[PDB]
Amino acid sequence: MRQFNVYLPGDLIRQVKHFAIDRELSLSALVAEALRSYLDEHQRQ
């Protein structure tokens, strides 16, 4: 795993952490899933 750094709205970051807490997910796992799901959804040729 490598370090990934990006600017986001502070309230988005809070919503993501809240969501992780409710599903007992690590941030790394949740964020990875959200990114993979978006890339999958938006893939084109």
Next chain:
Amino acid sequence: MRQFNVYLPGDLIRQVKHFAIDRELSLSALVAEALRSYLDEHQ
């Protein structure tokens, strides 16, 4: 806005970065949309 630091698979990071290049997005815009869409769909 604020810095968000998280550890991810290196190959996913590269994939994300390549995608942002091809779609002419900032990483901030891309990541924000992926997270927002994920949260939106799953609530």
